[PDB]
Symmetry: D2
Subunit: 493 residues, 4 copies
Amino acid sequence: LPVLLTDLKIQYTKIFINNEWHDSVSGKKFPVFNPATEEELCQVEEGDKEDVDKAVKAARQAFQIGSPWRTMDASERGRLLYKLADLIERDRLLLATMESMNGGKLYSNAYLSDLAGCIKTLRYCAGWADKIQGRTIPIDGNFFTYTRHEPIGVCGQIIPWNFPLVMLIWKIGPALSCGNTVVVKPAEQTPLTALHVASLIKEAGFPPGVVNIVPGYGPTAGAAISSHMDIDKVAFTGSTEVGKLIKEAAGKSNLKRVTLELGGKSPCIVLADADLDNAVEFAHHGVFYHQGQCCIAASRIFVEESIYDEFVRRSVERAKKYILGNPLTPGVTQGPQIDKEQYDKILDLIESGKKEGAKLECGGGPWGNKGYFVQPTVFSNVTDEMRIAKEEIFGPVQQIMKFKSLDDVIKRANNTFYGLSAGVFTKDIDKAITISSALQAGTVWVNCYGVVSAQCPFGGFKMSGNGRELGEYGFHEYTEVKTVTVKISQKNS
Amino acid sequence: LPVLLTDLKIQYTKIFINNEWHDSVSGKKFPVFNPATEEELCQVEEGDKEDVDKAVKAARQAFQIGSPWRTMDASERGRLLYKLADLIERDRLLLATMESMNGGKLYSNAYLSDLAGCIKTLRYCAGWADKIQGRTIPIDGNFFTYTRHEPIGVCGQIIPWNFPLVMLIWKIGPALSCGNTVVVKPAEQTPLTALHVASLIKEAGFPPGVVNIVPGYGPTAGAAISSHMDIDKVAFTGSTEVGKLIKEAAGKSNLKRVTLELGGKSPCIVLADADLDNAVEFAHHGVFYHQGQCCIAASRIFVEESIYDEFVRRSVERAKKYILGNPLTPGVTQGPQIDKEQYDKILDLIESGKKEGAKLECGGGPWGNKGYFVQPTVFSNVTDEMRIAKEEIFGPVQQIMKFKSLDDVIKRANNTFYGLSAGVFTKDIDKAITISSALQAGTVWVNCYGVVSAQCPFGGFKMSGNGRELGEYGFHEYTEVKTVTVKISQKNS
Amino acid sequence: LPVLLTDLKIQYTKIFINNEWHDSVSGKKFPVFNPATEEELCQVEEGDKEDVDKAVKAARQAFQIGSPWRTMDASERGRLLYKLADLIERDRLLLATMESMNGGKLYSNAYLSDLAGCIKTLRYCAGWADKIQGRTIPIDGNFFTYTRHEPIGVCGQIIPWNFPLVMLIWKIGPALSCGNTVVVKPAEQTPLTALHVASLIKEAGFPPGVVNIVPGYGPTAGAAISSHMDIDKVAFTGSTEVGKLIKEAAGKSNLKRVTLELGGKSPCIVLADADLDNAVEFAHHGVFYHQGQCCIAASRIFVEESIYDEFVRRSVERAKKYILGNPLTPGVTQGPQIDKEQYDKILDLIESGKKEGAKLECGGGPWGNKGYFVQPTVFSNVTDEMRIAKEEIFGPVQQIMKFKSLDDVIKRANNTFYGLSAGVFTKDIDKAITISSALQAGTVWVNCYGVVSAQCPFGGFKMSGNGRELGEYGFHEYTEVKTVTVKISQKNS
Amino acid sequence: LPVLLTDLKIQYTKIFINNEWHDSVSGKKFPVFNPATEEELCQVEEGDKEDVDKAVKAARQAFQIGSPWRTMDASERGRLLYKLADLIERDRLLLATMESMNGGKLYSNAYLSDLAGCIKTLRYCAGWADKIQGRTIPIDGNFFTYTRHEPIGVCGQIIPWNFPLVMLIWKIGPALSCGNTVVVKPAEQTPLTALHVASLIKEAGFPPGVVNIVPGYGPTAGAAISSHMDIDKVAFTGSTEVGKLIKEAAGKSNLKRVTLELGGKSPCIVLADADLDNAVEFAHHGVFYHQGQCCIAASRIFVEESIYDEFVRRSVERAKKYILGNPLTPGVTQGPQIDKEQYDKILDLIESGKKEGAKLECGGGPWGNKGYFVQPTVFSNVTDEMRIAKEEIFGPVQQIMKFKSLDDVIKRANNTFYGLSAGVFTKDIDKAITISSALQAGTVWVNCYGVVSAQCPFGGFKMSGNGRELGEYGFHEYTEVKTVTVKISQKNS
Ligand SMILES: NC(=O)C1=CN([C@@H]2O[C@H](COP(=O)(O)OP(=O)(O)OC[C@H]3O[C@@H](n4cnc5c(N)ncnc54)[C@H](O)[C@@H]3O)[C@@H](O)[C@H]2O)C=CC1
Ligand SMILES: Cc1ccccc1-n1c(SCc2cccc(F)c2)nc2n[nH]cc2c1=O
Ligand SMILES: [Cl-]
Ligand SMILES: [Cl-]
Ligand SMILES: [Cl-]
Ligand SMILES: [Cl-]
Ligand SMILES: [Yb+3]
Ligand SMILES: [Yb+3]
């Protein structure tokens, strides 16, 4: 695990449009902070409506018929993506450090996992570029019919603060491989890595206007994207609240295509026959990963009565090993929460668990003199109407619950408007297959948790989102199908 | 072209839920009229919120894990669809007559085309049932990963009055083949054929609650579907206005998946080298078909100057041959418009064409003492800011316009928030391919128009809709993908 | 289980070419016998070279560009297949009776399973007809590129005597759905059902020459197909010996495409943790089905030492319940072998098991005064170099063997030039996945055996064959891909 | 067009097995010559049976379950292929020079086209590695069924001398992306570039035994591959003669999968309405490219009478511009033929054209004092029974013929046992589509010729080969499908 052997100097702090750096139209700038110390890192140009309009004009223009981005070989789109990946690999130390410092993200994860995932996902998406194919179709009558799987056009992409880089690449990888142009709104908390990557998009040689990045706020820059009359599609990861707002803004404006990923309250079902240690470990990592700030956090763990006490005891043991501190310092195993709002939300919900009569096993309060740190907390005997069983906490707060009836627990597991993911732990083949089939969730893990890869489509059932990202299937959501039907004298099979 | 040799007796006039006929909860009924005579045909139970709630409970229950519809072979879903098609083929005379009488639809088309399309589309969709497949995926790490392409769940389906039967089958065919359950809201103008088909769904042996049909009004029964918290997906064909309302209702309620088809202002581009007669004929049929009441109506026809006068003259000649009258009487070649609202809208827009200084070639007013008949009308010298060039008329009103610059006409053709379809007429290969690629439209026809088949996906660019119906691609919009990832000791390729 | 309530009258005994019945060119006829009584059933026209030449001319002519079979809608090919299926369903009693009487096949299976499989497979294949699609491809440079998945052309299809009808439909279903024409050579033992089906192909309305059926002998009619210079492809199921001859004949003549299915020596691996009764039952059915005359017969069963004695004891118990007799008489549970050659081969191999020092648990000799009956026989303590462990017996002869080392048994299971299928019986997920991945076999069943369906591709590893039949994947082997690449002024994505 | 600024030193001259250099078992070596000067370049270890056996043992061992090549991520296979491509890009000057010197291949083409194609094809194939997916299948009954698209195993790959490097990459790219191991037999004329690439496979880090390269002769090393009992599949490009031998050897030995590409006698059809200059240019390049030594050479050009004389005159003009000489010297536009045998074959066929009464327009004899040079030669008034109209010449010998009947010329174009490719030149859409549909050829170009790319599948109809290379479709021929069917308590859709 190597490190930057030189202090991080922040350089890229402007709005990126047509491969150049722009001040905000208003002249305004906003602060960006380090969540571990609560100190300002730098000022960044604040994008708003007017800036979004500039980015959209640039992206429209880059999408025009006859432009370099439309006429270049598909394989050359792929080539540019593979080059960007190599650039990101080149600046990996730097990027991982920036991610950690701005994101409150453990550096060893930032380096070994976030940066790796970026690189690998870009490479994956690069490979798809010239393998996006339409069809020839044996339509009734004397016609030749084919389809083109075209890019959609200008895609507005709104990204959260929990995985700034991964989410950037998850959005732009697919969009660009299929031949779209994009207007990206990073989280106001975490603009910095996206702008470094913007420099690399320029260095890689993407045509100007193919990628535009407008840092700024949600009700300002975000609302302007969702309501924009010349944006063909918006993709979003974040809160359910905002998801509703994007969808409605889109309905009122130009009926743009919308896709959403909106977090979860994901359940694990642990059967008596499960490898217990394996189940405890994955379930534990599944809820605590990145300070609980994962859409897929395993925030309800149902364990069969006969092993419930053991499961609880081992889980507490495991949660009691963390060292809180600066995400940059080696051996530190838990960073802060992203900001005040998330922090207050977590403490408030922890308070509800106590009041509602859940059993506190460890943690339960804040930590330190600065940083938005929260002690890793475990509740046992949680019941299904408690706030902590129902609401996404997005903090290091694990819920453990008992079942003895299998039909009953599947129904409890499904009894949520969420449905991002789930976990099933058992050694029995039939139960692995039938439970996973019956769970209403977009990804179901068996005897593992949190395994996510570029090859697999990813997204929600129900109010956890719509559409899929990544995998072959995800690519469909960045194409628009056109059917072309030509009259002919006579067809032959 | 055979006919019913017995007067049509209307029989099915109730709400269809769990394979039984129900009165409205309120006890209310509404009238259904014949558009050709303006006389009431019968009374039909008026579904509203409460009735939609009953249908949704039935459809949820039929979708439950372990139910007959979830556990039966995929091939048996297909078998039921092929059986329904045979039933519809059995009652073809009757259905075509009901469609014509209630829909104001020419009987020869109703029989030879609408009924045929229903039958053929059901058969197409039946064949897909056991060929809906997921994937096995060579994910990073030691895991086995597969996807299931599951049904979504309860699908609310809102249908217009222009093609009552075709639209019913376009909705239920795909939905059912993939294994969904459905709640169908037919157009208040045209409930009758859908309820006959409901009797046939029962006779075919679909499990109760797989198909439910709730006749009723849009702001009542329709709004209840769009806003319903236990409906997983709504599909809609109709007005842009309502499309916006569905999308926003869905955003506010449970973020249900939405797909929309919303009409158009579809352009044809006719080049000097075109087969002129062929172009005039298809363009003519492309705008006049079913009294102009087609989403794909070719409502802007751009013709190269050097053949523009000829194109106009032949088009007028062609439009002057129609015989208006009862859609049931043989030799009648133009029925009425569906109702008062559409009628007033058409006359109003015709009036705007006159006032705005378009050239009237023929028609321009109403016809007859009853029925909502409108004379087939042609405007030449139409310009791009005239209301008749911009707004979907949905009446027998053809617009013809001149161009001489090809780059310019592609831009005029694309300069619309619509994008359902287009037509290109030329003998030059390069122009056929490059123009069709550059047109922003979901289907582009070359040297033909209005060719639509079960094998081809169908839908809009831009504000003409989202998602695709039919073809392989359409089937994707009725599945929800679940990724299942199993930990294994060691994988091998 | 209903029966024909009328004696079977044989009617169709001629060569079928261009939808008409032809005498053999030579005037010769050959006998067809009932394997249960050894009595001649009828005489059938003997096809030879000259007759095959007539069928190939007919099939070539039906495949010509512009013919009805090439120009008809794909959906109409499908329609004809679905109609044939309905006809076969209509004559199911008759066909099942003919199959049983000529094939020595238990009537209850003939009716409930062979006839059902025919019908269901035809329906499956009918659904694919208009869903065979090519691609549009984003090739480098300014070109439009698409592929057509055309039919290959004239396909020669050589069928065995064990599943005459199923194999006929497995060959013609796919071939016809994709739009090929065919020349079918049924087994000399079992021409009769194929010719009844030929009458039904005519009644369904297939264009003449689309299906031609030439009954006759292998070195005569078969060799003429394999060596024919105007046959584009030969498909074959049967012996390894003949498979080699087909492939070499094809190499010397016109390099026609070849696909082969050639039987097996398929292994089951039964782990200590297996549901024992379930494993014994499926393994038992897996070897005894149709008098052992299945390509997939589970002819080596490796059982973990600790349950080996139990497994053996229960298996013997099960094998001792059969009633031998006329396949037509209800309650009869084992018919005769097809003929003298197979009979002698089975007895000879049984003799080798005794001599080589395998343990005889039951059976071991012939039965009855007529018919080619063989007692159901079980060997335990079989070892890997015994003839009965190595050679396909194709008789009711079950081999049971012991293992204790799992790595070792996978290697023993794979140590064969065959590889059609295998079975794994365990309750452990990891073992189910890793064993099945490691077995070199085309289909691997887990906790079952002999489950074969139209939706699944089917074929061999190694010397058990090449290519796949059925499923989506099988359809590929009946298409020829043509790439069409058009120069264009400028492409756009 | 840069050059090596340093004389080419030959270094790699051994047999490559398990990532190490081996002498021939026999100790024998054979000469390798430069076709332009007829001088020996070096000696190379002569592989034979015994050496092929060593390579096959290495490749089997590398394919074993649990080996690094089987267990590594698919994405990592892809990573290794992309790395090899970068290495080849690194040594591009060197490789292009080696190709030109050993292959008699124009250096500017070697560099700008062969080397480019290698690089681009490797990159294409790298992208497929982790996108090779199987299916989950909704089989009848209570089962879970999936397919794995596994690698086949050990693939023997026999390569010709016309495109040594391109053919190497066309074989290994796909094979390796899918996860096979390979035993490559380069052409005895042209081993040298393949062994340089072998050094790069080692430097890239492929596991030992994944790629093995055995230089040597056809009846020795080649026959040993085709007849080898532990080689799962052989792929071959070359003569029809040898193709027959491979197929038959495979039939007799272990029934290994075979695919073949075997050259052609590819026709162009030029209609009166064609862009004449464009047609003359592409047709000209289509026959003369690389001294006529292309499988796809446009060796029969049918031109409509009314433009035939013009077409001929312009074609002669074009053929008369070549400068023959050392393929390394800039401005040289035609190299020698590969060797004596090809040279004699070309002269002999030229002699037949004269004798049979074809009209000689230019060329007709050899050139120079050394090298196997042949003057670029054009025949007009060629007729369909002349040897030069029927036999693949594989020399710079163009045939031009007249037609006036379109139905007739399609039949003449198809009247050949070949079918690799064809060209159609016209401005009419209908004719482009209907002619290309009617031509019996694997690739059909419209208004171009010789456009071949990694994205498009490539191969023959009829005796021009079987199976396809490259594109999505080509990848199928390097997988073996296994169906896995698991018994379950109850399935749900
Ligand atoms: N894969 C399977 O399901 C089958 C496997 N077999 C195996 O083959 C063994 C021998 O049985 P046979 O009946 O002799 O099978 P076989 O392979 O000779 O007969 C099957 C078909 O091939 C034809 N045939 C025979 N000689 C031919 C030739 N020279 N050219 C072209 N076609 C020819 C036959 O006329 C028949 O239509 C069996 O004991 C069994 O192990 C036999 C039948 C089916
Ligand atoms: C597949 C099936 C459907 C319906 C009823 C029974 C079966 N079936 C069979 S069928 C054997 C067969 C028939 C044709 C081709 C083949 F490759 C194999 N073979 C079997 N062997 N052992 C159990 C079997 C079975 O259940
Ligand atoms: Cl998928
Ligand atoms: Cl498509
Ligand atoms: Cl498959
Ligand atoms: Cl393809
Ligand atoms: Yb006897
Ligand atoms: Yb010489």
